[PDB]
Amino acid sequence: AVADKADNAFMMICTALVLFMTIPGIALFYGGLIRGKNVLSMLTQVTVTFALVCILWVVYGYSLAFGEGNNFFGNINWLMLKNIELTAVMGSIYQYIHVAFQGSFACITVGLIVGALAERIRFSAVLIFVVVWLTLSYIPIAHMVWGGGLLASHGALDFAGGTVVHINAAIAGLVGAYLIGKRVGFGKEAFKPHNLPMVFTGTAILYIGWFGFNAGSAGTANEIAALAFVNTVVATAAAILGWIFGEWALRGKPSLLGACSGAIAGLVGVTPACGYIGVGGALIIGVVAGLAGLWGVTMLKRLLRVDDPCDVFGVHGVCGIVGCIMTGIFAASSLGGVGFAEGVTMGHQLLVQLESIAITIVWSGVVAFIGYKLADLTVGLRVPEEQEREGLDVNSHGENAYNA
Amino acid sequence: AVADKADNAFMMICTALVLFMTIPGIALFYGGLIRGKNVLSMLTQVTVTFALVCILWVVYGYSLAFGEGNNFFGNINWLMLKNIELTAVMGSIYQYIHVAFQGSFACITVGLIVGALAERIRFSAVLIFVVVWLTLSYIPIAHMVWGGGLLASHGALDFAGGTVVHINAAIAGLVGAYLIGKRVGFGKEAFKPHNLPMVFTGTAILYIGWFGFNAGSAGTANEIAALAFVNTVVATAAAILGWIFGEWALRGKPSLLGACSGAIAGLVGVTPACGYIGVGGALIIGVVAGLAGLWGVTMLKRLLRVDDPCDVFGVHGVCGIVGCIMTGIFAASSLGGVGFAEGVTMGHQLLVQLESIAITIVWSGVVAFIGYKLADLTVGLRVPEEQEREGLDVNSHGENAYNA
Amino acid sequence: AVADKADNAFMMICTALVLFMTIPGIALFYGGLIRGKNVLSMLTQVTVTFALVCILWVVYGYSLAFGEGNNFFGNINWLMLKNIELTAVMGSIYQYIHVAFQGSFACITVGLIVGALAERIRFSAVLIFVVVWLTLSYIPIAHMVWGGGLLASHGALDFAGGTVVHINAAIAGLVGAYLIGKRVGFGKEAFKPHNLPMVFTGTAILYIGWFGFNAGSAGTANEIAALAFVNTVVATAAAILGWIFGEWALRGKPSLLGACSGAIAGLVGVTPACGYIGVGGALIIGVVAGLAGLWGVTMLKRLLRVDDPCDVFGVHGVCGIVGCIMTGIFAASSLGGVGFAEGVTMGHQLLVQLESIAITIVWSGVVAFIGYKLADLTVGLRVPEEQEREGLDVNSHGENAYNA
Amino acid sequence: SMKLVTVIIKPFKLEDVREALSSIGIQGLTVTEVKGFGRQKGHAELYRGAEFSVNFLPKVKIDVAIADDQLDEVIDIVSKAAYTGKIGDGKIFVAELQRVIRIRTGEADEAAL
Amino acid sequence: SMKLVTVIIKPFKLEDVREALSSIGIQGLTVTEVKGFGRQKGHAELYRGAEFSVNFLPKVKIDVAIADDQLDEVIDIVSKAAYTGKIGDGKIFVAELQRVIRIRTGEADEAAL
Amino acid sequence: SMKLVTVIIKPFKLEDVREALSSIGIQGLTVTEVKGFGRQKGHAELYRGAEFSVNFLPKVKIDVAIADDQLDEVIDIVSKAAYTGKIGDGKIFVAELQRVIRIRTGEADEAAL
Lengths: 404, 404, 404, 113, 113, 113
Ligand SMILES: Nc1ncnc2c1ncn2[C@@H]1O[C@H](COP(=O)(O)OP(=O)(O)O)[C@@H](O)[C@H]1O
Ligand SMILES: Nc1ncnc2c1ncn2[C@@H]1O[C@H](COP(=O)(O)OP(=O)(O)O)[C@@H](O)[C@H]1O
Ligand SMILES: Nc1ncnc2c1ncn2[C@@H]1O[C@H](COP(=O)(O)OP(=O)(O)O)[C@@H](O)[C@H]1O
Ligand SMILES: CCCCCCCCOC1O[C@H](CO)[C@@H](O)[C@H](O)[C@H]1O
Ligand SMILES: CCCCCCCCOC1O[C@H](CO)[C@@H](O)[C@H](O)[C@H]1O
Ligand SMILES: CCCCCCCCOC1O[C@H](CO)[C@@H](O)[C@H](O)[C@H]1O
Ligand SMILES: CCCCCCCCOC1O[C@H](CO)[C@@H](O)[C@H](O)[C@H]1O
Ligand SMILES: CCCCCCCCOC1O[C@H](CO)[C@@H](O)[C@H](O)[C@H]1O
Ligand SMILES: CCCCCCCCO[C@@H]1O[C@H](CO)[C@@H](O)[C@H](O)[C@H]1O
Ligand SMILES: CCCCCCCCO[C@@H]1O[C@H](CO)[C@@H](O)[C@H](O)[C@H]1O
Ligand SMILES: CCCCCCCCO[C@@H]1O[C@H](CO)[C@@H](O)[C@H](O)[C@H]1O
Ligand SMILES: CCCCCCCCO[C@@H]1O[C@H](CO)[C@@H](O)[C@H](O)[C@H]1O
Ligand SMILES: CCCCCCCCO[C@@H]1O[C@H](CO)[C@@H](O)[C@H](O)[C@H]1O
Ligand SMILES: CCCCCCCCO[C@@H]1O[C@H](CO)[C@@H](O)[C@H](O)[C@H]1O
Ligand SMILES: CCCCCCCCO[C@@H]1O[C@H](CO)[C@@H](O)[C@H](O)[C@H]1O
Ligand SMILES: CCCCCCCCO[C@@H]1O[C@H](CO)[C@@H](O)[C@H](O)[C@H]1O
Ligand SMILES: CCCCCCCCO[C@@H]1O[C@H](CO)[C@@H](O)[C@H](O)[C@H]1O
Ligand SMILES: CCCCCCCCO[C@@H]1O[C@H](CO)[C@@H](O)[C@H](O)[C@H]1O
Ligand SMILES: CCCCCCCCO[C@@H]1O[C@H](CO)[C@@H](O)[C@H](O)[C@H]1O
Ligand SMILES: CCCCCCCCO[C@@H]1O[C@H](CO)[C@@H](O)[C@H](O)[C@H]1O
Ligand SMILES: CCCCCCCCO[C@H]1O[C@H](CO)[C@@H](O)[C@H](O)[C@H]1O
Ligand SMILES: CCCCCCCCO[C@H]1O[C@H](CO)[C@@H](O)[C@H](O)[C@H]1O
Ligand SMILES: CCCCCCCCO[C@H]1O[C@H](CO)[C@@H](O)[C@H](O)[C@H]1O
Known about the structure:
The complex is a heterohexamer, with three copies of chain A and three copies of chain D.
Chain A: H1 5-33, H2 39-66, E1 89-90, E2 93-94, H3 95-113, H4 123-146, H5 150-153, H6 162-180, H7 196-215, H8 223-251, H9 256-270, H10 279-304, H11 312-330, H12 346-378, H13 385-390, H14 392-397
Antiparallel strand pairs in A: 1-2
Chain D: E1 2-9, H1 14-23, E2 29-37, E3 45-47, E4 50-52, E5 57-67, H2 71-82, E6 91-97, E7 99-102
Antiparallel strand pairs in D: 1-5, 1-6, 2-5, 3-4
The complex binds adenosine-5'-diphosphate (3 copies) and octyl beta-D-glucopyranoside (20 copies).
The site of one octyl beta-D-glucopyranoside (BOG) has 6 residues of chain B, from α10 and α11.
PDB class: transport protein/signaling protein
Keywords: membrane protein, ammonia, Structural Genomics
Assembly: hexameric
């Protein structure tokens, strides 16, 4: 109707904060976790996929995600944002702000994937994959959940993207990691993080930008933004402590990387929940997500026998699943949440959540498989072994990170 | 009454900015100042105390700080934020935003302390200390100054926390540093900062987040927020130049660490003052705080014969005292300030400021002493000498920061 | 008239974001591009010039830039911000916010210059230069373009400062680089960037802060802020891809530094344009600016035979010129822009743009020449050769960046 | 009759070389990060307009003091463990040590290791 | 009659060792950061699911060229200064130098130091 | 009859020294970053209240194995290339190598280089 300038302001700043999560947050987070000879490949992959996603989003992605269409995609009425008047309002903000805000979600989702592919993927293969997967997985899942499609029509609860973002990315990453195979040296050689302060810096930036991600998903600077903000603080803090105490108890020491990973686990877990639950719910989701993440990167990783160097699946997939499920519990009025929709019971909501999770996993997994196969058929997924030994920075990018 | 969405928006973003000051600002600032073998201990201490403070704040801290009670603490009516309606308004914003904003102050205050304890404190001892000190020092001093208690009732001026934050932390740190004693090698070995660009990055983030800290303390995006913002710019710039010219003149060279320390000195000095003074007052407070900080880390440090590796006391304590005093001068209408309260003279205001400073120092000092003694009796404050020589990262945390 | 709190909020946060571009964005960007023995000199130069600019801005700069005067400068009515009531409104925000926001532009503009002078300039010479150049180049060009002077009166289009910021700085830098001469070892020795992840971090921060720079130049959280925001996303992404594909095609590999440089090229190119053009225009400006920047640091650099270590001219000068020109094309209604002013044709607008560019280049170049000569006559521009070999950090600043 | 054996190898062969040495009762040694130039040469690097066609390769240098009676076996065990067959595998150097002392105890020669 | 003395020590003993050497007229020397393996071994490190039970220790390696007449005193003065009595204090190695040249002046042997 | 030549030089002379060596058929060598103390001493450094008046200088150490017949020429070519005439130009050390082996092929001595 009319744009509220307070909401315009809030939502432009929230968008900058989400963009900050990718540029540089996720780049530094994954960059620090891998070896020095490969850091620039991670930074370049995040930066160039970011740029590609931004362009594909304005060309067709936003239209097909958020346009009215069927249960699975929108339309092509907003190609290059044509047919959107500058003064057009979506909710209580200019639609152009909505375009940017939702585009930033596309970016972080894709940035998340590359941590699974690190150190042996061919750069051109990543770009081809992204084009396929953004178009056929991100866009339809966004439409299904947030653009009025199938899952929305069933009353799925996902405030800021446990499905659309975290599970979606985690599955794409996991399928990628299986398809390209284990790094050379995998079971015998040491892969320590090359720069833990760099990982911490990335964690911190992800955390700060996440307020934009979670609170901005209210679309307005109202009481639900406030609820989501506070739930984000609490859930993150609870997960850090959950992880640390699990680690300290079971392995003997509280660690920096543990504390960072716990933060992320909580942020992921509370993502679907943050605008539907109460603070006691956020605390519980946090502790659970922290411990679930810890399990995810230790025992589950061993079970899966996959090389996901940045544990994208163990954190984003596991904690996204936990969060999506717990949202269907803690939304209850009796548990301090905002309440189920008319005619909906807890049992019915849990089923809807599980259905949404299942559909996301299969949809993303099938699409990711297709994208990676296309990349493999055109350019080849995996670099030659000797390029992998020397490192991708020199071989794919012609640069060394640190020059004395 | 009713929440202004413009104020909600401003205050949520200000909260993110204050959180940014801790995660990662203060962690990188102190992390760069210490040795490489100890960097992860600083990052982990900041991150895990941050999480603990966030949880204790929502469980009971906010209630006891900001609830109505006596001169010294509030009440337990808002335990786990129970009894706060989501649509409850405090000032012109949703109360939930007020909870987060004030919680972020608790976090940075505690993060500040750990710089005094660096390189020889036991990790579990920090956590025990924090629980005691947050509960019995931060919460009551916050109540006394900002929650309508003793010092507020006497008309103390402290806009953004020269007492509640900077003096409070600096004294806790100083008492900590005396109690645990000097690092091994103290007078004979070289402790250079391991990473000055890391210190600079932390300084920069502290500076940027400080706009949230200072301008948000207006509680609204009004003319007092604007005044505080501009005073923050000016005072910081003046202190950088004050410090640099002092350093250049007295020691022969202008230094990066000097410029960073001057920035912090100004930010600290203007903290109590920023929303009460004029820009000429900010300039003067800045220059004075810069030179006072320089004295604080050089001549005063030598006088005190204490090992405060990050000079928490020399900057935060000295400059907080300077700022608190100067606020009682520069608030005067005749000096471009907003004016003293009805019936108050400059002389009377200065006395109130000095009284507030005195009470903060004794209160924090006594409480800190108790917390550290509890930690010492339960887990032991100081790590064994050989752990200290090897570094806390490997010994307390099982990780090395930089892996080639 | 009356201040809109939504606009106050937006503009205070935009100001923090622009300040972030200097502290620490540009410092890390240039710091990573140069050698380790010189990193602290870059950080200190940015930090201390920042402080100086902040002070000179509030003392007289804002008054002379934005006060009403003649075609070339304003007045001294607002010395130390005297005569500005705290509740004074400029546009729809408190004037104090306008002071800070425009002061932050002065800061980044000056920070940009120092990349051209790196590794052999004397620290005191930079400070003297800045005083001259800020006062006699930045202030009058700001007045001419944005303070109602000569170029504004001719209807120049420059939304966020292709002339005032980028061309202005680039020319000052270029003249500086010619005057001080090539670094020792220039044609024979290897100058690799010492820390590319540091460069990436600076790039990222510049990008995120740039939303404040571009969207805040609307002065309100309205539809033009939204347009500028989205154009910033698109143009940056397009330039990253433009540069990368140019690099990949012509040199054989896509590089991290290429991707970062492309980002900056796009941001620079869209700076004058962002609030006047449509998204298709932003895409085109981006691709062109990316390729123009690539030419700028490769073929043009070779042509000019100047040592501009951070390629300030090749990116900021070239892309600022491209952007300023393209703004006079893409502002057209028929090309999706906001439309030319009454009575103005595309041909007439292009002439105005070219005139504005020409005046900026000569004005900045002449003033820069005078400032550098004053510095050279008083303190000497260039450090002795042996100080240059040892590095400026130890010699000018008494510090080493990285201490093991 | 004490020797210093220096080995310059590809960094990923370090663990293999260490395990081979420990297998014959040699666990004590010192490792240095070094930069190597030779038949194997670094890829070109490009940074904006700057091209660098001559670049070092990272290598690991192991220094291990041993008794003369261990030399032939060390050489053989290290050669096998460091071998990949591709250019750049590196070199073994052997020099005499006149003295080897354990600072802590003052033991000399074989007893210092 | 020229010797190269190599000393591998705990990094915190470097200043003490330097002062001891300067005290007998030896201020010129070269220091390298190295990684040590031996009786003293690194703590385990853990990074998420990854466990590393074998880790190097940082050490400092001093190389100092001296005349043969200084050797015994150097050994004694360095041993005392580097000593802590705990495992890992390190080693002294001594080898012959056939030639020592000061590049700047062309002086040789004792005159090159 | 194999020699190890060690050269400690100012880091900016490394390229010149490498080019001089390649000019006489020596392209294979190993480089280490080292810290030097001697006649040339580091500027004082100050960090807030902390003053450091004793500081190392960064240097580069080249180790190159050669045949005895190349020694005099190497010394001469390296001395010229590393020379600046200012204090701190550094040193050449020469020691005997008993054995030099190419791990990949097992070639020895001159054939291992
Ligand atoms: N003459 C030499 N002196 C010292 N080190 C050498 C010499 N030649 C080669 N090296 C070292 O050995 C490494 C491998 O040399 P290269 O010729 O590339 O392989 P290979 O030994 O298999 O022929 C180099 O990177 C360098 O560190
Ligand atoms: N045989 C060896 N050759 C070369 N260096 C060695 C050898 N043995 C030990 N070192 C070095 O000496 C250091 C101390 O060895 P260690 O056995 O731990 O202590 P100690 O010398 O007191 O017995 C190691 O960290 C390693 O750098
Ligand atoms: N006795 C020595 N043993 C080993 N290295 C030395 C010795 N003396 C000097 N050096 C090395 O040589 C470098 C230059 O020494 P210095 O006395 O400063 O210059 P010059 O060789 O020109 O007299 C030092 O930085 C150090 O690395
Ligand atoms: C998810 C991406 C795959 C779909 C790409 C083709 C999009 C064109 O599909 C269409 O858009 C709308 C769908 O409701 C409708 O207007 C029409 O059925 C059809 O033109
Ligand atoms: C600063 C923390 C120490 C106090 C912890 C106990 C808090 C309970 O103290 C109380 O809360 C309010 C105080 O005005 C009142 O409702 C009651 O006097 C009392 O129940
Ligand atoms: C939870 C316990 C808090 C109260 C602790 C009181 C005991 C004081 O502890 C002490 O104080 C001195 C510090 O100056 C030490 O020197 C004494 O040795 C010690 O008795
Ligand atoms: C760009 C900086 C150079 C000018 C510095 C001197 C400024 C004083 O110049 C003036 O200010 C106004 C100009 O319109 C007018 O009030 C008067 O003409 C004059 O007092
Ligand atoms: C504050 C002084 C500013 C005016 C300086 C005018 C003097 C010009 O300075 C000069 O210009 C040339 C640069 O091309 C140099 O080559 C000349 O040697 C020198 O005379
Ligand atoms: C929250 C997600 C829980 C998923 C648990 C999956 C259990 C995986 O289990 C396994 O997967 C491996 C493939 O990786 C197979 O090789 C094993 O045979 C199979 O047991
Ligand atoms: C994944 C399985 C989750 C089981 C839900 C356990 C939560 C407790 O169970 C429930 O919670 C509410 C009481 O607070 C009631 O409204 C519900 O009727 C009741 O089912
Ligand atoms: C959408 C989720 C896709 C899950 C893909 C599971 C693929 C399991 O793949 C299996 O992985 C094992 C572990 O490495 C291997 O040992 C087996 O050879 C392989 O077939
Ligand atoms: C948006 C999708 C980006 C496409 C990136 C183009 C990658 C081109 O990369 C190439 O592909 C060929 C096929 O193997 C190779 O033979 C060429 O050597 C190589 O340049
Ligand atoms: C702004 C704060 C000013 C405080 C000045 C305190 C002067 C300290 O002075 C001293 O303290 C030492 C303990 O540290 C004692 O050992 C000395 O005897 C005493 O002179
Ligand atoms: C710590 C001691 C501070 C002394 C205060 C000195 C400031 C000048 O003194 C004063 O300032 C104002 C004039 O501008 C008047 O309003 C006051 O009456 C006067 O006391
Ligand atoms: C609330 C502020 C507490 C100030 C505590 C001052 C404690 C002084 O403690 C003193 O410190 C000296 C300096 O190291 C020591 O030499 C003395 O032995 C010690 O008693
Ligand atoms: C919020 C407060 C956090 C408490 C952290 C628990 C620290 C437990 O730490 C421990 O304490 C014991 C006492 O010395 C030791 O004996 C154990 O080895 C050690 O695990
Ligand atoms: C967008 C900016 C385009 C500028 C193109 C300038 C072409 C420069 O060209 C040259 O400049 C050199 C000085 O640097 C001179 O030495 C050369 O003689 C001259 O050909
Ligand atoms: C620097 C030279 C730029 C030449 C401008 C080329 C753009 C196409 O040309 C034009 O564009 C519009 C049609 O969309 C019309 O409004 C204009 O009349 C026409 O001149
Ligand atoms: C406002 C823009 C100023 C442009 C200044 C151009 C100065 C050209 O200066 C020229 O540069 C050449 C390249 O290094 C040198 O070889 C020439 O000797 C020198 O005169
Ligand atoms: C805002 C402008 C800052 C001025 C910085 C002052 C620089 C003083 O720097 C100096 O200048 C003299 C002239 O060569 C030298 O002789 C002195 O050694 C040196 O201290
Ligand atoms: C819809 C979900 C699709 C899941 C696809 C799983 C693909 C993993 O299947 C695999 O890929 C490789 C063969 O290409 C094998 O080498 C791996 O061992 C195996 O895990
Ligand atoms: C209310 C303020 C309380 C101040 C407490 C000061 C405690 C410092 O007192 C001390 O502690 C140690 C003994 O425990 C001694 O070893 C130190 O030398 C001494 O400074
Ligand atoms: C208005 C634009 C003024 C341009 C000034 C160009 C100054 C560059 O002129 C120069 O400066 C030095 C002499 O001072 C010479 O050594 C350089 O080679 C030459 O490029």
